[PDB]
A and B are shown apart, each in its own frame.
Chain A
Amino acid sequence: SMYTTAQLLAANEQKFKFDPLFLRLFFRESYPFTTEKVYLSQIPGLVN
């Protein structure tokens, strides 16, 4: 049908910059929990 010809030279996939710095630096551990809710506690610790 069509008599033209072509050749492909360069194919690039541009990627936007992204780097999870805050996960890398601070949150270094994972705690998978199977229950419905999660408790976090504190203690005052002021002794006269």
Chain B
Amino acid sequence: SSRLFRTQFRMVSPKRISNPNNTGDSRNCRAGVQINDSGAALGYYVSEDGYPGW
């Protein structure tokens, strides 16, 4: 960015967030949302959508 602000936001469809490679849900990683010992969430697995078909 040559402009003054370098912050940009990108919308994400909820369909993209899921487990990597469509694996079964483990104790700490449920539906692409990683969980610590508590109920909090640390990080999310976001895939890439391919219109060509794969």
A residues at B contact (CB < 8 Å):
29-32
Contacts and interface: CB of A to CB of B under 8 A. Distances in A.
Interface residues of B, number: 4
A30 B29 CA distance: 13
Interface string B18-48: 0001111000000000000000000000000
Nearest to B21: A29
A11 B27 CA distance: 34
A30 B23 CA distance: 6
Contacts of B23: 29-31
A21 B23 CA distance: 20
A20 B23 CA distance: 20
A47 B22 CA distance: 30
Contacts of A29: 21, 23
